[PDB]
Every structure is written in C-alpha cells, then in structure tokens.
Design a binder for these strands. Structure first.
Ligand code: ADP
Ligand code: ADP
Ligand code: K
Ligand code: MG
Ligand code: ZN
Length: 678
RNA sequence: GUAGUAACAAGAGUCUGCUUCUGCU
C-alpha cells in the first residue's frame, strides 16, 4: 500500500510523460511502480481527454494475477477494470470491453487478432500501454507485432500515440561480447518499444538491497559414473541399428554419416535431420519408395529412443533409462508391429536381462543424483521448514526425478510435487493450468510436500511460494534466465545451487556473471546520455528496422509422411479462420481412419471428436483430428507436419513445418460451399 | 494453429532448425 522510495524513484521518468523501461529485480514491485504511473496518468489528462490504459501479460496466470491487482487497486477509486484472454474471447467483444473500461488487462494475441480482424484500427484508442516482461518484444512475438503497428503509426505521423511502459528484470545482452555490443543490444530493445528513458534504482539502492537479497550461489561440479556398462550395451544396439539402416538403403546419398557420438545432443539433432532426408526419398517404383521410407522412419525412431535413454541415464538412474525403453517397446508391441519392428524389439529383449541386472547395481549409482540427494538431505535437516524448487530441463528428466523422490523420500518423509508446461496436442505428459495451480497450492500449504520439481514453466510468471533453496540440476541458460530464477528465492537467507558434471555448464555460469555485470555497466553508460542523444540513437535503429521490414513486406499432392501413401490434393483443402486445414470430399474419407480423441479439447469454435490416422495398418501415422464446427459434425483437420508434399508439376517432394508458404494457394472455408456437399 | 534474442546447437557467405523447453490462440 505504501510506496517504497526506490519505487517512487523508478516511476519518475514515466510520471514526466516519457516512454520508459523499468529495469529492476524480479519481485521488487515493478507492477506497483506501474500502478503509481497509472494513478498519476489518470489524474493529469489534458482537458477533454479520458485515459485508457492497457496492461499486457504474456501468460494467462500472470494476466489473472495482474487483473486481480488492478481490480483491487482501482475499482475502489471508481474505475472500471476488465480482462480479456483466450478463455473469454468467446463471450467477450474486444471493442466493447475497451469502450467500457478505464483499464483493460489482456494477453497480447487478443489485441493482435482484433487488429487482424478489423475490430480495432488504431493504437490511438489507448493513452498508456504497459508491457509486462517487455524483453519479449522481439521477432514476431505478439509484443513486437503490436509495436511494429505502433511504429508504422509513428512513421505516418498523423496521430497521438499512447505512452509506453516496459517492465523487465533483464534487458539482456544478446550475442554481445563487450560493452559496446551490449549497449547496441539494449538500444535495439529500446528501439522496438520506442523507449525514451531507462529507469533503474540509483539513489535508493540500499533500501532496494534490504528487500531483495541476491541468493548465495554455489556451483558444484560432480563426477560421472566411473564405468557405464549400460551406455556400452545401448551404444552397441545403436551401432547395430545404424548398420541395419545402411543395409536397407544407402542413407549417405540422402544425409551425411553419423559420428557415432551416441548419447549427445549432436546425435539427437543428426537423427532428426536424417529423418527429414529419409522421408523425402523418391524412387521410380512407388511401392519400393514406400517400403524404404517406412523402414528408415522406423530405424530413426528407434535410434532416437536409444539416444534419449542414454541421456536419461546420464542425469538419472539406470532404472529410469530402462523404464523409458521398456515403455517405448510396449508401445511398439501394441502398434503396427511389422517385421522390422519385431526384429528391433527382439534385439533389445536379448539384452534386457543384463540391463535389468545392471540397473540393480547400487555401487554404480549416478554420482550427480547422489549429490542432489545429499543437498536436499542437508537442507531439510538444517531447516525442516525449507521449501525447494528443483529445476531440470526435460519432461523425461523431471519425471525420473519425481520417481526417485517419491520412491526414496527425502529424509524418508519429504514428498515432491511436479510442475510441467501444458500438454501439447496428444501428449500424455503435460499439465493443464488448473492442474498447475493445484500442484502449487499443495506446495504452498502442505506440511510434507516441500519440494517442487519443475521445467522452465517455473522460471517466472506463475505465482509460486518463496523458496529458500533453488537447485538447478544440469539447468543452464542465458543471463536473463539466471536473473529470473533468482526471483524464486529472493528471501533473506536463500540459496541457489547449480549441480553439473559438465565443465561447459560451469563455464556458462561464469560467462553469465560476466554478462550481467556488462549489462549493468552498459545501462549505466546509456543513462548518462541526454534525451537528445538517446532519442537520436533510437530513431536511427527504428529507421534501419523500417527499411528492412519494408524490403521484405503450385498444386501439390500430400503424401503420408511415414509410408508415403497418397492422402489428398491441395485443391481439396479449405482454411478455417486462417489456421485449420480441412479436407473436402468423399474420396479423402477412404484414405484415413479414426479413434475417439483422448482429450476432447475445445478451441476457436471446434469440438474435437477423434484422432485421424493413415488407413494403412502397417503405418498408422497420426494425420490430425476430426471436429464438429457449425452445422458440420465430422470435419478432418490435417496437420502439415504429418505429410510430405509432392509437386504435381515437377514430381519433387518437399517438407513444410508451417502452412504460411502454402496458404496463399489454398481456398478459404466457405459455409455455402460446405452446405452443398450434403 | 502459431511465437520465443528460451535450450541445444550444427552448418552456409549476416542467413538457417521442424529437435529440447515454454508461452499464446
Ligand atoms: O494443425 C492442427 C491445428 O489446426 C489444430 N490444433 C491442434 N491443437 C491446437 C492448438 N493448441 N491451437 C490451435 N490449433 C490447434 O488441429 C490440427 C491438428 O493438430 P493435432 O492433431 O496435433 O491436434 P491434437 O488434438 O493435439 O492431437
Ligand atoms: N511498496 C510495497 N508495499 C507492499 N508490498 C509491496 C510493495 N511493492 C511490492 N510489494 C509486493 O511485492 C510483490 C512483488 O511485486 P510485483 O510488482 O509483482 O513485482 P515485479 O513486478 O517486480 O516482479 C507483490 O506481492 C507486491 O504486493
Ligand atoms: K492402404
Ligand atoms: Mg546455448
Ligand atoms: Zn501412412
């Protein structure tokens, strides 16, 4: 309720009407600073003008959190405060919420769509726009789509633009190596948001430092297993699988050779590149093309899972890596299970007895995992009230760590929670926002559930109880990530421990510390510039971007991406709402089969009904979903990643991961056209 | 369906990833 002195300081450039970037630590009260700026803004409007304020948040939970904050603060003062996100875009009309509210809180895509659809024509409808996590204003991020529009209006110079406020804990350094390059990076970000001043705590630092304690860092380098018989057995299986592939087809006319760097990210990326090349193989004999493509698809999928298991074993237990394989092979056994699949499964099952034996050898436990357990034991022994956030990179690793921490509870009583990002498409892994909230509620209040294991979903945004320990388990990243994760343990006495067996990860954390100091010094040098100097720099970058932006601004058969069977013509596709690609006609119904959808999501007016698969029982490739839409109970919606495209002109096959390059040649859905097909 | 100056990169004479992760609609 009562503003801190550093908060009044941070607010000053914005109160004086300048577009301002507030750079200050996570949890230091930047949102409250924006509230101060808003109060002043409302009270100092020129005559005949009423303020209209929009607050943008990148994440639905942050939208909800900040909407509640603005409601509580400003409704008592007679102000109308409303929110729009994807949830309520079905009920809500955007223009009318804007008309009726003094403050709108939104996710940015809501606005983008309302410009796209002509509902909104000018950003001059707002007098103040507040960008939470404004460092996201880059590329084709929704933030940068909106600011591009702002700058297009600014260039046409026939309108009053809203004042801009950006909130961030880190402006970043980009790829800079020195203070000069860092300054350029920071001016770049400022240029995208039309910033006129950067506001940091400079006069009231000792107050700031009282509220925000940088957690104490520990970087622990640990050893790998002395011997790795599990890795040797899997690596040999991988070698044999590559040799099998080469007997099926000379893949080195299609992709390069592997370096046999099994169990690395480089090998992963190699498999995925090789998969792409294999699926684009073309032969005169279409039967043989299908047979070879399918076989190579299978070989590469198997190589991938072995590579995955190696990586799991490096970070977790042998039994975790083995579990992952046995669950994969169960899936293989229940699928098409063609001869090649039976063979690969039998080759694994030959080794399985020995692998099981290896997985019970306690003397070869993962040293990194042992260190992690010692860390947690020490923490909870010292302070039973500890709450810990344990970060790890992959869904698979977080799942393995959950299993470890549940089978073997810390001090035989601490229980883990798990937080992952949302399940995408058909993923059994992943969590809805309600599930996410449930986990965090338990973590916040439970007596024994005092450990949260998380992917990057926990980095920032969603409200999490303060943690006095944060453990980064092989969890490296850039200086902005470093800075954000600090906000999870910003309580006096908090600690942050990084555990790795990799000297590169240690070196990475050293470089982050150097970058953060470089970033802070660059900001200081920029703040010595007068307004004239700053504005001239930002104008120059804006014109460069304008000129770049300006100088940028055939019929195909779709074939199953696995077995190469004919699916449909581009002529048959219709686009719904610029996004969803349906296929018309009776012919196409012969080409696919369906099963009930496991998770009947709704979105953009569709009821998900079924999953859609290649009709070839020896293939069963996932092609998309079927939906109900309007008066139509059964529409197939294809996903571009499931197919290879073949030019009816050249006969050449191509790969597309987005529809963008193709959409131009496709017709839009027309309810009248559709209505006539029944 | 789409985004990321997030991950991890590997390549091409500043451009490129569909992988990892997360976000949004
Ligand atoms: O190409 C896909 C899209 O047109 C549509 N779809 C699926 N998921 C989404 C989300 N999250 N937002 C917008 N549009 C979506 O469905 C097409 C098929 O995708 P997929 O087969 O992966 O759907 P799924 O239900 O996840 O299996
Ligand atoms: N002056 C203040 N008095 C009381 N609580 C404050 C004050 N400033 C910030 N807080 C609290 O600190 C927390 C973090 O503030 P927030 O604005 O969300 O931080 P940031 O946006 O910098 O991450 C919030 O719960 C907020 O209520
Ligand atoms: K068939
Ligand atoms: Mg990197
Ligand atoms: Zn198929």
């Amino acid at each position: 309720k009562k503003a801190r002195s550093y908060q009044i300081e941070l607010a000053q450039p914005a109160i004086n009407g300048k577009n301002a970037l507030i750079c200050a630590p996570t949890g230091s009260g930047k949102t409250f600073v924006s509230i101060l700026i808003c109060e002043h803004h409302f009270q100092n409007m020129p005559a005949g003008r009423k303020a209209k304020v929009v607050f943008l948040a990148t994440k639905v939970p942050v939208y909800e959190q900040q909407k509640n904050v603005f409601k509580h603060h400003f409704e008592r003062q007679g102000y109308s405060v409303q929110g729009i996100s994807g949830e309520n875009f079905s009920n809500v009309s955007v223009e009318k919420v804007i008309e009726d509210s003094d403050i709108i809180v939104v996710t940015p895509q809501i606005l983008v769509n309302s410009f796209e659809d002509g509902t909104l024509t000018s950003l001059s409808i707002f007098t103040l726009m507040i960008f939470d996590q404004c460092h996201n204003t880059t590329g084709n991020h929704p933030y940068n789509v909106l600011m591009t529009r702002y700058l297009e209006q600014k260039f046409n110079s026939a309108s009053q633009l809203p004042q801009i406020l950006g909130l961030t804990a880190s402006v970043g350094v980009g790829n800079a190596k020195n203070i000069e390059e860092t300054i350029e990076h920071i001016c770049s970000l400022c240029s995208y948001l039309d910033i006129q001043a950067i506001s940091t705590v400079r006069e009231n630092i000792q107050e700031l430092q009282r509220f925000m304690n940088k957690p104490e860092i520990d970087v622990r380098l640990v050893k790998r297993r002395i011997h790795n018989p599990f890795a040797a057995i899997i690596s040999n299986l991988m070698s044999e699988t590559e040799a099998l592939m080469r007997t099926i087809y000379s893949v080195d006319t299609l992709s390069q050779n592997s370096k046999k760097d099994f169990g690395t990210q480089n090998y992963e990326h190699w498999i995925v590149v090789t998969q792409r090349k294999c699926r684009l193989l073309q032969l005169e004999d279409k039967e043989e093309e299908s047979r070879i493509c399918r076989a190579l698809f299978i070989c590469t999928e198997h190589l991938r899972k072995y590579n995955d298991a190696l990586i799991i074993s490096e970070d977790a237990r042998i039994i975790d890596a083995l579990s992952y394989l046995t669950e994969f092979f169960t899936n293989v056994k229940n699928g098409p299970y063609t001869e090649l699949e039976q063979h690969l499964t039998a080759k694994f099952q030959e080794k399985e007895p020995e692998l099981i034996a290896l997985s019970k050898d306690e003397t070869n436990e993962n040293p990194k995992l042992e260190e992690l357990v010692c860390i947690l034991d020490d923490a909870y022994r010292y302070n039973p009230q500890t709450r810990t956030l344990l970060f790890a990179k992959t869904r698979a690793l977080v799942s393995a760590l959950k299993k470890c921490m549940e089978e073997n509870p810390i001090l035989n009583y601490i229980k883990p929670g798990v937080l992952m990002g949302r399940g995408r498409r058909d993923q059994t892994t992943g969590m809805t926002l309600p599930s996410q909230k449930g986990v965090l509620d338990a973590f916040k209040t439970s007596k024994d559930n005092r450990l949260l294991i998380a992917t990057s979903v926990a980095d920032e945004g969603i409200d999490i109880v303060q943690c006095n320990l944060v453990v980064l388990y092989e969890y490296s990243g850039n200086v902005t990530k470093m800075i954000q994760v600090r906000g999870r343990g910003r309580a006096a006495g908090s600690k942050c421990i990084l555990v790795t067996s990799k000297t590169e990860v240690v070196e990475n954390e050293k470089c982050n510390r150097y970058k953060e100091e470089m970033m802070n010094k660059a900001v200081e040098k920029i703040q010595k510039w007068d307004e004239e100097t700053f504005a001239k720099k930002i104008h120059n970058l804006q014109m460069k971007e304008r000129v770049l932006r300006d100088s940028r601004r055939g019929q195909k058969n779709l074939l199953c991406g696995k077995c190469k069977a004919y699916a449909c013509s581009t002529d048959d596709i219709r686009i719904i709402k610029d996004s969803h690609h349906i296929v018309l006609g009776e012919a196409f119904k012969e080409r696919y089969t369906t099963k009930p959808h496991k998770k009947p999501m709704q979105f953009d007016g569709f009821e998900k009904k079924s999953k859609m698969y290649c009709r070839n029982n020896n293939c069963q490739h996932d092609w998309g979903i079927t939906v109900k839409y309007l008066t139509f109970d059964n529409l197939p919606v294809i996903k571009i990643k499931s197919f290879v495209m073949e030019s009816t002109a050249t006969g050449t096959q191509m790969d597309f991961q987005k529809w963008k390059s193709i959409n131009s040649s496709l017709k839009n859905f027309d309810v009248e056209e559709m209505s006539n097909l029944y």
